[PDB]
RNA sequence: UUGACCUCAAAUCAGGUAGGAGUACCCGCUGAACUUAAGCAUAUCAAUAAGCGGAGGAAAAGAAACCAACCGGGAUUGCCUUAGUAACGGCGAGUGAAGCGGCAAAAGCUCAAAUUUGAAAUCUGGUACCUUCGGUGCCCGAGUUGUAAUUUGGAGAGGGCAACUUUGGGGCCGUUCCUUGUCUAUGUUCCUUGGAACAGGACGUCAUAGAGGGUGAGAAUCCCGUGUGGCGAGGAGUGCGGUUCUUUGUAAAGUGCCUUCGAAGAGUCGAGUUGUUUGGGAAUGCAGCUCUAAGUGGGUGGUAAAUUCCAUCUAAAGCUAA
Ligand SMILES: [Mg+2]
Ligand SMILES: [Mg+2]
Ligand SMILES: [Mg+2]
Ligand SMILES: [Mg+2]
Ligand SMILES: [Mg+2]
Ligand SMILES: [Mg+2]
Ligand SMILES: [Mg+2]
Ligand SMILES: [Mg+2]
Ligand SMILES: [Mg+2]
Ligand SMILES: [Mg+2]
C-alpha cells in the first residue's frame with residue numbers, strides 16, 4: 033500500500049491480489065523448495081504440483097468417439 | 100475371482116475414479132471457440148500472420164533422427180548470419196531461441212536460407228507512416244513449409260568392394276566391446292621392465 | 293570425435309559437416325576472478341581456521357594425508373571434497389612455514 | 392440394444408438364469424486375482440503357466456527407442472520402390488543404374504532375408520542387415536550400403 | 540546545561556491496511572478407516588474422505604543447476620500417444636511414471652550485482668496551484684549499514700578507434716467491443732360443425748419470416764415475436780482519416796573491429812542418519828537432527844564405490860498472457 037512500492041515497476045507486482053499470503057501457499061523460495069517445484073526427472077511427481085499431477089494421472093479421459 | 104481361459108486384465112478402478120471422469124462433450128464447442136479465438140486474434144493482429152517463423156531442426160533420439168521438423172526458434176548465430184539482430188527479429192515475426200546451438204552446417208544453412216526467404220517475402224510496415232495494407236496471410240508455416248532434405252538420388256552404379264558389410268557391423272561391435280580390456284592389456288604390456 | 297557413418301561401434305552415427313559453435317559465457321561460472329580471489333584471500337586471513345580445519349592440519353602433521361582425507365571425507369560430504377580440502381590445508385601448511 | 396439382451400427373456404423366471412441352489416452372490420471366490428496360488432491354482436497352471444515368480448534382470452529407466460529397429464524382409468523390399476518405377480527398374484535389370492532404396496526413409500532398422508528378391512541389382516541403404524540378407528542382395532548383383 | 544546518534548515505546552496523532560463470507564475449480568499442510576488381499580499385520584483403499592491455512596477469474600507452473608546420448612532437441616501448461624509399459628510390490632493382491640513423436644497455445648524476461656564519486660543524479664509525506672487514477676513548486680523526512688542510472692550470463696562492462704540506422708506522447712467524431720432502445724411482410728374472406736374456430740372445406744397472400752409462445756379446440760398469414768436490414772443512446776488503457784505540444788533535439792537505442800576484464804545467491808549445495816513419500820529399485824522428493832563445501836567448479840547423466848575422461852546445464856533470488 034506504500035506508494036514507493038505501488039510506483040517503481042520492479043516491485044509493484046507484489047501489489048497484485050494473486051500475491052496475498054505467498055508464504056501460506058508455498059510461493060516463497062522455501063515454499064517451492066518444500067513443494068518440490070523443480071525441473072527434470074528427479075521431480076516427476078512435483079513440477080506442476082503433485083495434487084494436480086495426481087488428478088491428471090488418475091482422471092479417466094473419455095472422448096465422444098471412444099478411443 | 101479367477102475363471103476360464105481369458106487374458107489376465109489390469110483395469111485400475113479400485114479408487115473413486117468416478118469422481119474424476121472427464122467426458123469431452125465440449126469437443127465441438129472448444130473447436131468452435133478455438134476457431135473464434137483464431138479469428139479474433141487475427142483481427143487483433145491484422146495483417147501479421149498469426150504465428151512466428153520457426154526454424155527447421157533435426158529431431159533427437161535415433162528412432163526419430165531421420166526426420167526434420169519445426170523447432171522453437173532461430174539461434175542467435177543464425178539470426179546474425181541472416182543479417183539482423185535477435186531483438187529486432189523478435190519484432191518482425193521471427194522466433195529466436197537463445198539456448199540452441201549449431202553443430203550441423205546443413206541445418207545452419209537451411210535456417211539461414213529460411214530466414215533470407217522470409218525477409219524477402221515480408222513487407223515490414225513503416226513505423227509511423229501511412230503503411231498501405233498488404234492482405235493478411237494467416238500462417239507462416241503454410242507459406243514457408245518444412246521440407247525433408249533429399250539424401251540420395253533414385254539410381255546409381257553398384258559399388259561393391261566385397262567388404263561384406265555384415266562383417267563390418269560384427270567387427271565394429273567387437274572393437275567397442277573389447278576396447279577397454281585390451282587398452283588395459285596394452286598398458287600392462289607397457290608396464291613391463 | 294568424427295563419426296564413422298555406421299550405426300554401431302565406437303564413434304557410431306552419421307558423418308556431418310561440423311561447426312563448433314561460439315562458446316557460451318555460462319560454462320565459465322566456476323571462474324578465476326581476480327576480485328573474488330582477492331576477497332577470498334583477505335577473508336581467509338581475517339577469519340582464520342575452523343575447528344575441523346585445525347584437526348585436519350594437525351593430522352596432516354601427525355598421522356598423514358590418507359587419514360586426513362578419511363576424516364575429511366567424514367567431515368565434508370564426499371571424497372572429492374575431502375581431497376580438495378586436504379590439498380587446501382597442505383598449501384596452508386606450506387605457506388605458514390615458507391618465508 | 393437393451394431389447395436384445397437375455398435380461399428381457401429372464402423376466403418372469405425367478406433366478407434370472409443364475410440358479411436356485413447356487414443363488415447368485417457377491418464375490419464367492421474372492422475379488423480380482425485372489426487365491427491364484429491357493430484356490431485358483433489349477434486355473435493358473437493350466438492357462439497361465441509362468442505367471443508367478445521372477446524372470447531375469449531388471450532394466451532401470453528403459454527407453455523404447457534404444458530398441459527401435461523395425462525389420463524389413465527381402466520378400467517385400469521392392470514395395471519400397473513406388474509402383475510406377477518398380478516395373479521399369481525390374482525390366483532390363485542393370486548395374487551402373489540400380490535403384491537406391493533407403494530403408495530408414497521408409498522406417499525400418501534392419502534387413503532380414505525371408506526370401507527371393509528377383510535378380511535385379513539393388514543398392515540397399517540399411518542401418519543393419521543380417522548375413523543372409525547380405526548374401527541374397529549380393530547374389531542379385533547388388534550392394535548393401537551401411538548408413539546411420 | 541545543550542545538541543545529536545542508536546534502540547525501544549506512547550498517542551482517539553496524519554494517512555492506510557488485515558480479519559469474515561463464498562469455496563465448483565486452485566496452492567498448501569494435516570490425515571483415517573471401512574474396503575481389497577477370499578483370514579491378516581506390510582501393502583491396498585489413499586499420498587483419498589474429514590480437519591485446517593491461503594488465492595483468483597482462473598490458479599499453479601514457467602523461460603533449464605532440463606531432456607538426452609541423437610545428424611541432437613530446447614520455458615511452462617493441456618490433449619493424443621508413450622502405457623497398463625520401464626519399474627515398484629507378503630514380486631501376492633495390487634500399483635505405476637518419463638524422455639521421444641503429433642497437436643492446442645505460444646512470449647519473453649528481472650534483480651544481487653561494479654566508484655555517480657566532478658552531482659543521491661532516487662523516493663514517501665505535507666503544503667500551494669493546476670491538465671486531479673496524476674503534474675509542478677517549496678518544505679520536512681527516508682536514504683550512503685546504498686535510493687536512482689548502467690549490467691543478468693543469450694551475455695555484458697571499461698577503454699580505443701573507419702561508421703551508419705532509428706526520435707516519443709496527448710483530446711475529438713466514426714470505427715474493435717460491451718450494454719441497451721426503436722422501426723421493419725402477408726386473410727381474421729365465404730360455407731359447415733361447435734359454447735368458443737385456432738377444426739373441416741373453398742378461394743387467396745407473404746415467406747432471407749412455416750422457430751416459439753399467447754389468444755374460448757391443431758393459427759406462417761389475429762397478436763407478440765421470428766427473419767432481414769435501418770435508425771439511435773450510454774460506456775471500454777485503442778488497429779486508422781484528420782488534429783496539435785514543433786530547437787520535444789549534439790537525448791536515448793542498436794550495429795564493426797582491437798584490447799583488458801567478465802563480479803554470477805552458504806548452514807546453502809552436498810553427506811550421514813531418521814521418518815515420510817515415490818514407479819524411482821545399495822534412498823524419487825520432502826522434512827527433522829548432525830556434519831558442512833568449492834571456485835576449468837557445482838549440479839545432473841535412474842546399481843553402491845575408487846580412478847580416468849566425456850556430455851549437458853549454471854541451483855541455493857524474482858516476474859510473466861495463452
Ligand atoms: Mg499475476
Ligand atoms: Mg517463488
Ligand atoms: Mg510443502
Ligand atoms: Mg510419478
Ligand atoms: Mg507440489
Ligand atoms: Mg489439483
Ligand atoms: Mg496414468
Ligand atoms: Mg471424441
Ligand atoms: Mg489409448
Ligand atoms: Mg476352465
Ligand SMILES: [Mg+2]
Pocket residue numbers: none
Ligand atoms: Mg466441424
Ligand SMILES: [Mg+2]
Pocket residue numbers: 125128129130132133
Ligand atoms: Mg469452448
Ligand SMILES: [Mg+2]
Pocket residue numbers: 136137140149
Ligand atoms: Mg492462434
Ligand SMILES: [Mg+2]
Pocket residue numbers: 200201202203206
Ligand atoms: Mg546441430
Ligand SMILES: [Mg+2]
Pocket residue numbers: 318692853
Ligand atoms: Mg545460462
Ligand SMILES: [Mg+2]
Pocket residue numbers: none
Ligand atoms: Mg613463524
Ligand SMILES: [Mg+2]
Pocket residue numbers: 395
Ligand atoms: Mg438384433
Ligand SMILES: [Mg+2]
Pocket residue numbers: 403404405
Ligand atoms: Mg416368476
Ligand SMILES: [Mg+2]
Pocket residue numbers: 400401402403404
Ligand atoms: Mg417371460
Ligand SMILES: [Mg+2]
Pocket residue numbers: 404
Ligand atoms: Mg426354466
Ligand SMILES: [Mg+2]
Pocket residue numbers: 408409
Ligand atoms: Mg446363466
Ligand SMILES: [Mg+2]
Pocket residue numbers: 406410411414
Ligand atoms: Mg433365489
Ligand SMILES: [Mg+2]
Pocket residue numbers: 413414415419
Ligand atoms: Mg456360484
Ligand SMILES: [Mg+2]
Pocket residue numbers: 413415416
Ligand atoms: Mg454363480
Ligand SMILES: [Mg+2]
Pocket residue numbers: 429
Ligand atoms: Mg493354503
Ligand SMILES: [Mg+2]
Pocket residue numbers: 442443444445630
Ligand atoms: Mg508374480
